[PDB]
Point group: C5
Chain length 311, copies 5
């Protein structure tokens, strides 16, 4: 119950491996995801080395309390993982093979700028703090890094589960810390968004544009203002459940643009009626006739500019 | 507290069994359900063998700490089950009969394509990782697999609770994994859905069609747009509380179809009034008269096509 | 420790008793309630019997670990109760007086058919599984079954806390199980419903009926459709927070009836205007005049039929 | 680890004290509040008495496991408090001074009848169960009862933290129990309720009264019904998030009164138009003219009557 | 397991240091934030001092149970922190280098008066209570006080993590308490508020002002009342999820001002129409013409006055 002694000066290499069993509860708003996986750890301790000819065992199994085990922690977790040691095996040369099954709520930030067409990289940071007698450094056993085929996140396409092999070694509170990066690449399943959000939101906007084929100010006010209410009501219905994002998103820009179009269409309706009442029906009619083409064209162009700037 | 030694290299057979006591909290959105049940386990540990004559007892009872117990875990669980060992009984041959009462939040995916007429198969995967000394394989004791008659999920008809007897044995991180599939088949109780969701949503749509028995553009705009508001408001009220499904559902298709019908009815109302104002009341009136038949017929037809494509 | 040995063939009788300290968190939607109470247990274990003269003590206190204690569990709980043993006392004849203070989330179904005029019976099922050496049977002492006077559930009148004295002994997985039914009878405090939900809901409906004292189709469309919106908006405001009930409720029937009345009133308004425009103002006016009496009378009758069928 | 012995058949007096460190999470709907405080306990155990001369120390410090400590529990708590023993000190006469720092979610009912002008008394009930060897009685060390000056509840003025010195001793499950009442008096500081809820809710109602200065039935229907929608919509926005209170509140009475006024104003608008259309414009105009004074006067008076009946 | 005996009058100095690893879950409404960090503690216990020649070791490692460790607690936490001792190291002179990794939900009040342009100072109060034998005083080494570069709070700019070096030593329950103030300075990311909340809410208000370029009372009622509905609906959509603040905020003042403007615009519309109908179209037209300038000018001025009073 002291770290293994160094054969030559060099630090202890703790070989790691994460194997995803289950991925669930991806909360976009909280920027957290819950994960259930295996953590494999391999290190050599020659104090645990033995001759198989005299000892007469394949490998010696130990209790966690019995031997020295490195303290591997996660950087980006809410609280410490719920871990359960599955097996500890010691080969004759002193190579300890540790395996545990853990569940953790991982805090990983998400970029919503290209939502719902976005893709994300979920991070899991492994960390080990070096001891007095010797430095501890992390490594990746690529054979022991993977994911269950059945691993699923509803609404996401799980691309890959890989690790950045070279650790980030640095000093923290007068000790060396070796940090590893396990990445889960996911891409969103944006299909339903079109018939479910895009298309009914666009219909409401189009209904407001019928005020360009009418001269009735009462019918026109009822058209643009009632559709503005239906727009807001629709947005309450299809609300992300996510408190507003501090940065400007593609989706956010378009919604802003739609509120601007409701305001501009009211201006038009207001102008047209005032010109008609102010004995100028030539200007009133030409503005209305222009708007019939102007409104959809400006909308289509501004939308293309936005789609281009974001993607 | 090491696995029982093999006589002739044979793997240890752990006879399982799950008996549902309570099933509750089925969260459609989270694709999770909470379960309270019995887990029965039986295996032979000859190290515990005794002679009932010298012992004076025909069976021996042990504390979990006292003997070796296989590490049975569930694959699709949020965290490890809250288990409480009920009884451990050893017969003279050294056959252990283990029983525990556990509670677990099981992650099982759900297909909402045929909602609310859907049926689901809930899975519970039992798993055991083999040891260095010997391999461990799972088995189903069919006499120990069942459910309490009083087991209920509000709004579901619990068809059956069975297990796929042949385990899925496979290699993972250089060891054998014997996995079992326990299945809970449930079918939805969709009656209340007709008077609560379907009919009041259909009435609102029908109200919009009264604009085909009017020539008043002000009354017509008020009809189609106010009903569209009422539709959205109704949907906010009867909202599933489920963030939108990534795939297209039967329900989703119909709602989309309804939003399209609100838009088409506005087009009609817009066309009719423009023709009237453009000195063509013959065409205006014939379009309106056609819509009176067209709208319900196309709706009934498109609905049958949708019902066919989904079921 | 193993169970106490019997002279009398009859199994071991464990005298139970539950005393409610606090009742809180009654979730109508989840059909769960949280409870904090005392669990009293009594049984004779002659192995513990002593001579108070030679022992020098009239009563002996033991640690739960020290003696044999029956495994009492609850059938309808989310997870096993958080229990804390308060006292264990042994009398010279070997009688054990066990007492613990527990907290549990109890799953008890609720029938909303007569909501908000309903009354409910909350169940707590005590269970004990028989050992191999001897069978174990539960008993109630209704002196030991009670509740704190200050026990409260907001919006409910806590009638009684009692137990069904005859236990339900039955075989499960080749062993006997003696089950007790503890019942908490509660009745709803429905006063607030009239001034909060029922009267404002009736007012909106009556507003729609003023369309029978008008000939203005624009004012009439605005009356029936705007009130339908206000009805839905009201229902969003006074929403039960309960996902729709799979069965037909009294409340559910009436709400359905109200949506039907909104649709029928639109039909009337539509018919009246079409007859007027189709040079038939005699029929139009007689339909409107009839509706003035028909609508409230049919509403009052249909409501009485519903109230009768449900109560 | 047995209770201290009585010299002359006296019960053990446990001197208590609670010192509020933090008060937070007051949930009006759940009728719970979370508290972080110090619990001080003092009692005389002569088995711990010593001669400071021979001992060399004026005070002795012990580990909780080392000595006998009374089991103090809380009556109205969700689960048992998270406690941590800060210090245990023994003086030469054997007077024990125990101190712990605990956090608890206390269930204390709230009376909303005078909301938002209400004041509440939060209770914390201390309890001790007497033991076989001797009876245990609670006492208040008033020197050890207080609160941190920085203790705050957002939207409340924390008046006082005091205890009812005379304990409530009584029998429970054949043992005497001593109960103490700690009271936290709070008064609601919700000044912003006037500009945030009261004034916008009144403006909406006043807008409906403008239909008494109009003869246009279409404009009037649009005024009273649209404002009724805006009223409901406003109430959805400023919703307490508290499921309806079973009893009639001051706030509840006024909201009811407002819904009645919307209905009465519709009746007026309906009557006025019907009289006008039924060739009686003298009565129609006199009713409208009356309403202009009647409506605000009846509102102001009924409001005063309500304010008087509740306060 | 007694405090170390000093020769010097001065109390024991415990050098503290907090290092933020993760900051998450900042709940504006609850005025709480969750934190994951390192707690470093340094003190000298001469009883631990050793000859490293005789000992053979330059540093000694101890288990928390093995040695005396000061009881460091947090003042403003929900429950005591979930701590995990990372390392304990002793040098030949008796210096203890303690390090733990803790997670805590910190209660820190927030001032919303200047929201969404606000900045906040989050507090973490460290505290140590002095023992019988000697007083214990806290110290800050600002070298050890830091934060991970990757520490983030969505929508906030984390300015600095620091500590007020001079501890607040005071008497509590006849003992000394040394308290340290750790501060996290954050400033809000208000950009998205302009296009998401400010601008669309203004557009709706402006739409209501078009009622100053119309004489149609039906169109005007529809304008002012429908926009008031859209305003409320918008506020439901962009709702903070925060129950109203007991104090008057900048945002709160403006929203109140907007509701006043909706009411004043209704008064105008009502006055205009009544003057027109009361054969005075000169006054009606001059009031309308004035409002066109008055309304935006009064709005712009009142807004500047509010912005000045709050900032
Ligand atoms: C008040 C009635 C309603 C729909 C209610 Br959400 C409205 O708000 N505005 C309108 O212009 N028309 C309407 O029908
Ligand atoms: Cl961890
Ligand atoms: Cl498990
Ligand atoms: Cl239980
Ligand atoms: Cl407690
Ligand atoms: Cl703490």
């Amino acid at each position: 119950v002291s770290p293994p002694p160094p054969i030559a000066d060099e630090p202890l290499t703790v070989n790691t491996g994460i194997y995803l069993i289950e991925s669930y509860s991806l909360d976009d708003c909280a920027e957290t995801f819950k994960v259930n996986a295996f953590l494999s750890l391999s290190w050599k301790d020659r104090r645990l080395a033995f001759d198989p000819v005299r000892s007469g065992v394949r490998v010696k199994t130990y209790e966690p309390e019995a031997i020295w085990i490195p303290e591997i922690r996660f950087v980006n977790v809410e609280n410490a993982r719920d871990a359960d040691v599955v097996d500890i095996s010691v080969s004759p040369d002193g190579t300890v093979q540790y395996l545990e099954r853990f569940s953790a709520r991982v805090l990983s930030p998400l970029d919503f700028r290209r939502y719902p067409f976005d893709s994300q990289t979920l991070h899991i940071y492994l960390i080990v703090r070096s001891v007095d007698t010797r430095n501890i450094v992390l490594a990746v056993d690529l054979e022991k890094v993977g994911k269950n085929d059945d691993v699923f996140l509803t609404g996401w396409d799980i691309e890959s589960f890989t690790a950045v092999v070279k650790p980030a070694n640095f000093a923290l509170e007068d000790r060396l810390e070796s940090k590893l990066d396990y990445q889960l690449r996911i891409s969103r399943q944006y299909f339903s968004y079109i018939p479910n959000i895009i298309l009914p939101m666009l219909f409401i906007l189009f209904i407001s544009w019928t005020a360009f084929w009418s001269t009735s100010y009462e019918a026109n006010v009822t058209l643009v203002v009632s559709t503005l209410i239906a727009h807001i009501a629709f947005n309450i219905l299809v609300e992300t459940n996510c408190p507003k994002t501090p940065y400007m998103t593609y989706t956010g820009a378009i919604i802003f643009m739609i509120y601007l179009f409701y305001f501009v269409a009211v201006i038009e309706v207001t102008v047209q009626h005032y010109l008609k009442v102010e004995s100028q029906p030539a200007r009133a009619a030409s503005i209305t006739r222009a708007s019939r083409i102007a409104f959809p064209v400006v909308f289509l162009l501004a939308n293309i500019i936005l789609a281009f700037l974001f993607f």
